[PDB]
Amino acid sequence: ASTSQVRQNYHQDSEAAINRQINLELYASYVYLSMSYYFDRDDVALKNFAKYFLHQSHEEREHAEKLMKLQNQRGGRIFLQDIKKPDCDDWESGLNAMECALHLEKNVNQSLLELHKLATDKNDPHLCDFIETHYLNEQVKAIKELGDHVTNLRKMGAPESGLAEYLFDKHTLG
């Protein structure tokens, strides 16, 4: 119960929202992990898709860690939840994985936007700045990159052209 000695201008609702966001970032890490190893299957075998999604997975773990650090910086208390498995076991194709990643990042961005709204409603400028500085532009860039990737794959003839996915793997992700 008793307060943290550091706590100031940090609403309990913001504290809870940061714990939800921690879960979401870990969930995103897990989705990209799954995607990565899909492309490492002997019957998929797109090694640069695999590295690309692994890198993205590790990023998301870093995003979670920074929110954990924030929780403590502000005197909130971290409460972890189960990290749900991804929706898919088999991601179908390079294009479909990229489409799923785009939708994931748009979902994560919507959560961060709700979090910023809350921080604004509770007049927490430090939390607003945090989210702006470390998260919002990183989402806009990720979203733009994924859209670019989907566009290229589509134009190249994916998913039906295995050639298209192979060449994208070498030229864009390589």
Add this chain to the structure above:
Amino acid sequence: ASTSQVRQNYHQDSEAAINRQINLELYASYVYLSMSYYFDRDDVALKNFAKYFLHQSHEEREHAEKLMKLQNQRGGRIFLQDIKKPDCDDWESGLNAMECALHLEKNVNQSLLELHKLATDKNDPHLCDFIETHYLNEQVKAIKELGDHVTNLRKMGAPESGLAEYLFDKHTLG
């Protein structure tokens, strides 16, 4: 259904057991993550406990990844499950965290030993070698290190001596 072109001498039971082990390693990663940020709380404030457990968390993620790679190398199919949250939100003390980590690593080791027994019963020497080479000695070393740590903390007067935990933090984990 249809076979993987790479698959040879890889029993379905071993395939399932590797998927269980993947979950366990990710679970271990999550426990150490939680422990790490506990020591980063302003009311705990043992920064080298925090770094030590974070490093251990990242290790475990690497151990999971290597099993995922193995699954694919052998032509098995990765099936992920929810990563359960840790048993504890509050780890009490440096000593109690170390005790919990020891029990975690002994549990992980017991799983790997059951996995090796299975691999032996199914006459899978490649899988036996894998487990021996990449996992079993790494467990024995982790277990020994954690026991050493618990011993020192106990001898120093933890958990009642906050001095003991502070000095261990600086001299052993620092």
Add this chain to the structure above:
Amino acid sequence: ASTSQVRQNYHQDSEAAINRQINLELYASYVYLSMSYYFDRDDVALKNFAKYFLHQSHEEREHAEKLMKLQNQRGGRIFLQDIKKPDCDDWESGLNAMECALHLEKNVNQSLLELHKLATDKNDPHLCDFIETHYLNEQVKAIKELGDHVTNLRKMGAPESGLAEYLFDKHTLG
């Protein structure tokens, strides 16, 4: 007849099996040699297929040499046999060569697995360790790589697309 001064715990059946395995490795070297120069024909002209299979040929000669060294280390006696010519003179296509290499490596792996079973039945842990350390994972990696290659070529449109085989030659084997 009279024993080797070094010989210990080395069954005559293991000695014979190692001589068979020596022949098999040299045979594998010969198959890859043949494949290599097929891709060097003026009417095939895929120079990176050619280098890839030449490298694999030299590897296999090294694998044979290490078994010869082992035979002597254990006090067995090397008995060489004719190295049979490969099954094919003309390997048809990049894809078909890769398919044949996959089947070759799976055959070599099955032989090594039978050899390990024998070594296990004769309670020869040094020989078990030898095979595990120097051979079994090297087979699993070769098999996985070849499967990956076959998958890519298939997805790209080989063997009918001469473009697919040309581009694979440059991007994967180059």
Add this chain to the structure above:
Amino acid sequence: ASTSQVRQNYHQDSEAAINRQINLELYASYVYLSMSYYFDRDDVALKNFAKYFLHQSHEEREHAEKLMKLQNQRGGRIFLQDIKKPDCDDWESGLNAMECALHLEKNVNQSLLELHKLATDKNDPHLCDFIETHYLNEQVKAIKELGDHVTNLRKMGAPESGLAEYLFDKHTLG
């Protein structure tokens, strides 16, 4: 009585066997020590035989130390015994010393093989791996080297040719 906190899957019989093996390695160290200084006598005066056996003596002390470390890693308890003096005070000749070293290393290897059998019967894969990784191939190489040395000395005309032992000292051990 009470258990070690680290102990897992480590049979008391294996614990005792490791203590016996520790004694044997120290015993081997002592035999090579004695051999070394024999060749340093003014009436023997083969300085490279002396260095060769001293190096081998120090190796064996390292092999003992690694088993001591293992005992502790696994939660067993080290119990030392007297290190018996070697069988011989006077080793007769370079050839006879080499012959005695060959028989010593074959004895040490037989002990390690019995130890591996025990570890296998008690389903201790970590201990099996330990012995395989750190000991069994090191014995096979030592045995092969000693056999090679005995062969050369014999072919050269030792022990009757003092010239043979002198020249072996310079060309093989030098």
Add this chain to the structure above:
Amino acid sequence: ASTSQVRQNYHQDSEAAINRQINLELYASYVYLSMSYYFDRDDVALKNFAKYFLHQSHEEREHAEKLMKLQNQRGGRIFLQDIKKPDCDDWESGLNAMECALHLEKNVNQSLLELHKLATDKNDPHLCDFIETHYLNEQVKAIKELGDHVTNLRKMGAPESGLAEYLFDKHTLG
């Protein structure tokens, strides 16, 4: 049937003769391989004989490869045959191995001379130049070196003097 686009002034008899010569070079590689590991036996133990013959074995594999490349350069088609095992399993002595190698190289040289005669009869100056440039002087040098070696071993008292073979191993092959 249909011609190679590159083929010019390349008689079918020369094409067949190059395929025979390819087999012979691989056969020579195999003989030297066998010789090499004979000297690696614990009861022979002449390590520089072993390295010398291994080097010669690898050379011969290179000589085969260059003929394979030639076949393709000229638009002929490679047809491989079984590589026969060597005549001997046990090479008796350093001197006898050297004598056998001399006879092998003289046989290989006689084949190359017949090949040059054919190339001359078919007015193939490119093939004549090939053989002259890459093979004939390399044979004359190998033959001279082997004769020199046999002479020295004979003068030193081989094969009865095990000392002679030991010292030759160190001073000439070392």
Add this chain to the structure above:
Amino acid sequence: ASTSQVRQNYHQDSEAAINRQINLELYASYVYLSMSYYFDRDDVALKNFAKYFLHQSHEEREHAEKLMKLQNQRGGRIFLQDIKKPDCDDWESGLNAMECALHLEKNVNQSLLELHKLATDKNDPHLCDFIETHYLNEQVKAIKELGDHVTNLRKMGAPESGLAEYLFDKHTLG
């Protein structure tokens, strides 16, 4: 029986005394070896005590070797005896180990002093100089260091303070 060609002014009693001293130095090496691994136990876990005593163990082996060399330099003949196991299996504490080491080094010093008395009574100045140069001051320094260590541990509150032994381990032995 017959004399060594090198022997001069070297009494048989001195020869025997050097053989006794060789045994004592090896015995000291063994005591420190045992002490070392005691501190490596998971329930003791003082790693710098362990390194300190291991270093001391290796020193003593060097002291033995130098006496063996001396025996031969003077034309005496080395006669080895069993190296007795240490008095203790369990050394109780850092302080008690240090106390036992102090008593060991004082015993070794008393032996060397008796040896010097003998060398003096037999008018062997070379042996007197040997002992003075290589041994006596090395004992006085070891004794002083061990006394210093015991003093510090005692003042710090050992053996009851596990904190004291931990901090000594880091600051003095570290």
